[PDB]
Design a protein around this ligand. Sequence first.
Ligand SMILES: *[C@@H]1O[C@H](CO)[C@@H](O[C@@H]2O[C@H](CO)[C@@H](O)[C@H](O)[C@H]2NC(C)=O)[C@H](O)[C@H]1NC(C)=O
Ligand SMILES: *[C@@H]1O[C@H](CO)[C@@H](O[C@@H]2O[C@H](CO)[C@@H](O)[C@H](O)[C@H]2NC(C)=O)[C@H](O)[C@H]1NC(C)=O
Ligand SMILES: *[C@@H]1O[C@H](CO)[C@@H](O[C@@H]2O[C@H](CO)[C@@H](O)[C@H](O)[C@H]2NC(C)=O)[C@H](O)[C@H]1NC(C)=O
Ligand SMILES: *[C@@H]1O[C@H](CO)[C@@H](O[C@@H]2O[C@H](CO)[C@@H](O)[C@H](O)[C@H]2NC(C)=O)[C@H](O)[C@H]1NC(C)=O
Ligand SMILES: Cc1csc(N(C(=O)CSc2ccc(-c3ccccc3)nn2)C2CC2)n1
Ligand SMILES: Cc1csc(N(C(=O)CSc2ccc(-c3ccccc3)nn2)C2CC2)n1
Lengths: 542, 542
Amino acid sequence: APSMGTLMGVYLPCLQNIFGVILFLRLTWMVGTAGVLQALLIVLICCCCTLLTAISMSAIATNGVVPAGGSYFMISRSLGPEFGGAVGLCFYLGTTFAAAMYILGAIEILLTYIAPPAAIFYPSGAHDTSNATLNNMRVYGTIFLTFMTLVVFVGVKYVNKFASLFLACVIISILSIYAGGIKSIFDPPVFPVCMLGNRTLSRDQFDICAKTAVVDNETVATQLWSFFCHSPNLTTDSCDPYFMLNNVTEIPGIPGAAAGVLQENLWSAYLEKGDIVEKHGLPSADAPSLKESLPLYVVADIATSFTVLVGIFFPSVTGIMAGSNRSGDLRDAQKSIPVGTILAIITTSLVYFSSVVLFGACIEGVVLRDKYGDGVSRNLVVGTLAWPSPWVIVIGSFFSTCGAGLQSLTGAPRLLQAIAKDNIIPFLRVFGHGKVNGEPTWALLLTALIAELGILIASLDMVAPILSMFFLMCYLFVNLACAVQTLLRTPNWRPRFKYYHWALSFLGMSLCLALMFVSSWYYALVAMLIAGMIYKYIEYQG
Amino acid sequence: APSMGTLMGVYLPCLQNIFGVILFLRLTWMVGTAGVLQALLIVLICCCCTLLTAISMSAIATNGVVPAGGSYFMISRSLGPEFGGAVGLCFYLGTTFAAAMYILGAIEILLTYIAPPAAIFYPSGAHDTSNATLNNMRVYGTIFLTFMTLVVFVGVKYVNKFASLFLACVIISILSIYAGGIKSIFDPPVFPVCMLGNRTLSRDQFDICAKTAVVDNETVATQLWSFFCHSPNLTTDSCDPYFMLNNVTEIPGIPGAAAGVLQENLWSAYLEKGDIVEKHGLPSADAPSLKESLPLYVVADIATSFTVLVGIFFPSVTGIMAGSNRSGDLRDAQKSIPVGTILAIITTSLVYFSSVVLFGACIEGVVLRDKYGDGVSRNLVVGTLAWPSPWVIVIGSFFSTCGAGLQSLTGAPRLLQAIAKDNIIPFLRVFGHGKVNGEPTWALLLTALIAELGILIASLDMVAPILSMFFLMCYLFVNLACAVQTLLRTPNWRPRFKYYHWALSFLGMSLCLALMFVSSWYYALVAMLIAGMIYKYIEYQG
Ligand SMILES: *[C@@H]1O[C@H](CO)[C@@H](O[C@@H]2O[C@H](CO)[C@@H](O)[C@H](O)[C@H]2NC(C)=O)[C@H](O)[C@H]1NC(C)=O
Ligand SMILES: *[C@@H]1O[C@H](CO)[C@@H](O[C@@H]2O[C@H](CO)[C@@H](O)[C@H](O)[C@H]2NC(C)=O)[C@H](O)[C@H]1NC(C)=O
Ligand SMILES: *[C@@H]1O[C@H](CO)[C@@H](O[C@@H]2O[C@H](CO)[C@@H](O)[C@H](O)[C@H]2NC(C)=O)[C@H](O)[C@H]1NC(C)=O
Ligand SMILES: *[C@@H]1O[C@H](CO)[C@@H](O[C@@H]2O[C@H](CO)[C@@H](O)[C@H](O)[C@H]2NC(C)=O)[C@H](O)[C@H]1NC(C)=O
Ligand SMILES: Cc1csc(N(C(=O)CSc2ccc(-c3ccccc3)nn2)C2CC2)n1
Ligand SMILES: Cc1csc(N(C(=O)CSc2ccc(-c3ccccc3)nn2)C2CC2)n1
């Protein structure tokens, strides 16, 4: 018999789950590659679909009748059980796999940056190859998932504390990054980046960045010159003409917040796979490039385009259902779910916009698209923006991913119990009537096993678009259910009196159905096929 | 009401399906990497498991009661329907996917070698990237699969003709390769291979193989010297010391059949990924190797070991069920299936052994492990062994793969109909009572759709071990069923009177159950789980 109210019941969980980790790490890459304007447009599109879905859900919940079950109950009541069951099952699978991926990301964040100094779990995998890190993940993520499932098994009263602490840490990290940005505007930090000609080269091989140097009144080896130039004598031009013709120089990578940098970084620059990231302002002579010289540069990892960028970014904006599916507590959910969801979504969108604009206007353009940090000692560029130190941002990202995973894991069992509580799927009957007070039991086991299988895979990033397709399908179905319910003599209305809600819901449904289509039609077809199969099975069961 | 007799009914299909294409292309790689002795041992192990399964099947069929259905009916009658249904379903899936992979391999053989000159289907894909070839396959394989399904739909009376022609072509290719081997023993061909120091380098960049040459009474550019050495003047040692210190030379790659080559090629040589294949007899100085010089060599593709080699080779020895599942024709199958299966299996094993020994004793060891042909103009080494020309061997391989795919496609519907003919699986009832005369109809559609999905994947090589696991599970279950049936008061006995059949079946079952385990336990666990799920579903249906 829980009742979590509005603020903690539906606002904090949604905001905490929405943030993810894309803001801390991939946001700089996106802004650098697509420019400020295109990044703003893409974030606006994603937030627009999410806000339209939230508004449709609020309109549906205005009736104040949802007793239990998340969006699945609403969809089943409005449209019909046959579609509602399939949508709920797909959404539950997506939520479980998203929780698994969040936990994996948190574990890998911890391994790479959190405590690599403590052997970076070297005994766990010994770093023989990528398999070593994969095993380290497969073990540590499982060790953490067991604890997460154990904690979530107890009533949510003991779950909201950890989520609140994680959200507090994430907010602290965001405030620190903004303070670092303002300080850089008032006092730029130090962050040298090595650029030869007008290109950029990873500063991980040579100790110093200079074609020639003088030690003991004599020319030096110039380790940089040693690479791509095997002649250790100054009076020699044997190696590639690029070194001799072009010139090497060092430029700040974090010139702070200034009008010039932001204005120069406005437009976008998409590069195909294998290209070399190079600044445009400074000069560079043209000469043939030796094949061996290619590795000693900065090369794009994947092709860059608006559609691919939108597909990559969209998942970071999902998870608005944390406060929707969770309905056991929060008495009088009618007056709580919509306001909380809208507030959290709007705050997240505003923070995303401000962060993207600041990143565009603060950091040097060349560094931004230098993904993986190979350009500068592989260290986190955004971390240096943090006021105190990169540790604050790294720990913030780790806690954010862990908390998002925990919130998704907590949410999934409620939806599973709601689906099974109704005799809609014959073989899910046992997964109902959990512990007293309505807590989900005997379904937490199923969700935990699903997450454990996902962890055992330890490569869920391969099937990235499947979860996005599931989430978009659920949102589109919610929008359509709201539209039909309003059409079919729905008295539920906000203070504004009009029929424009029909058009709004249709616009959102079309918008981020085409969104999923452009993201990956290849997997959208598979997701639609799975939904159809579940719908046919439901029809057979009747 | 068909009756195909013994020879054509059960012998020709099994033998023509067993051959595959591994003999023509990968056999040389296996013999070169693992040596003659280890290749003989591995082929012996695979053929031993296959022959033990065949003998167990013959013992079971000695009762002369199998009216219809392949190994599934035997297993269900002996052990029990619960296991039989699951084993039959897994075997049917494996056969369908094997047919799809065979058709894909045939299409890719045609694209790469059959008719690349006819634009190599350039308009189909334009060769923009690997996606171009993938689309070419996805289209041509479907175009061929539609025709294959259409032909197989008609009674087998119109199917055995194409299989007979394909088997005739394959036998012609085998005879040609043996004749070429004997001729090389009596008259070695010409096949220069470029070796620097004691290593080997692909002869695809430079026109001639010589560190220096004289044209117009002057030193030449020496294109080979241009690669890895960018100084175009003879009086210069700027480039890597390997070229100057070591010496480059040309050696025959096909010295014919001689005692020395075979004796020197006896022992094995396993190399880890990234290694460089080098001969042992000739000398080679030691000096540092430049990083850029690495690509201009011959590098192993994957790690080499006995277990991985056995796992790779085993699928080339399966398919002995072609004459077993097909039982609609061949009246009095009791006196036909065992003799035909044993004869075909023994002939295939003998041909494999002889071919491996000849390959070991004929071709130069260095070339053998030069997979993909990059060592010598990417052209098929085994093709040059053919007496008339490589075209005979290439067409033989293409026809062999096409025929194997066609035979598997023909076999699958019979097993599907047999499974559905019995009300064991509730939802397979519709897939029964095909066209008159017992021909499979309304199940050929399902098998064709499964094959079409596999083609659309066009990358079935990724899940290679799954089909191997399915086949090994089916064979092991057949062996266990034979053992139990003989134990449970089975009067079926051959002229030899003894109870050693129990021990023989147990030995085979253990042998190539551990075979699948060593091949891939990772996927063996998944296959076992799928079989258990099918068994539980069957139990529920009762
Ligand atoms: C890299 O070195 C070149 C050297 O030419 C610089 O271009 C100028 O070249 C003239 C020719 O002797 C010199 O007198 C100038 O001193 C050079 N300019 C400078 C600033 O040194 C080129 O400018 C150098 N790179 C950069 C970024 O300045
Ligand atoms: C860095 O330098 C390159 C080349 O110097 C410039 O981009 C063009 O590159 C082509 C090479 O095919 C040159 O022919 C052009 O002269 C270069 N400038 C143009 C086309 O305006 C550019 O300065 C930089 N390239 C980037 C930033 O991608
Ligand atoms: C590659 O060239 C070397 C050159 O040293 C050959 O080794 C011998 O070196 C001496 C030293 O001058 C020469 O007089 C000999 O003529 C060289 N031998 C030969 C056969 O030319 C080395 O033998 C050469 N490579 C091969 C495979 O013979
Ligand atoms: C080809 O040459 C290599 C090296 O010259 C020989 O294998 C050994 O390689 C190591 C390199 O670390 C040398 O130190 C040894 O002197 C080489 N010979 C040995 C260990 O007996 C060998 O002749 C050839 N390598 C092959 C065939 O793999
Ligand atoms: C060390 C590190 C750096 S960056 C990083 N990352 C993360 O920590 C995120 S892992 C992740 C990815 C996707 C999803 C997801 C959620 C909902 C729907 C679809 C997908 N969830 N979680 C990933 C590469 C960006 N790890
Ligand atoms: C151009 C070319 C060269 S070599 C080649 N190959 C082929 O043509 C064979 S494609 C193939 C592979 C596996 C199976 C199979 C059958 C039964 C059970 C498990 C696997 N069937 N078919 C493949 C790489 C060797 N193509």
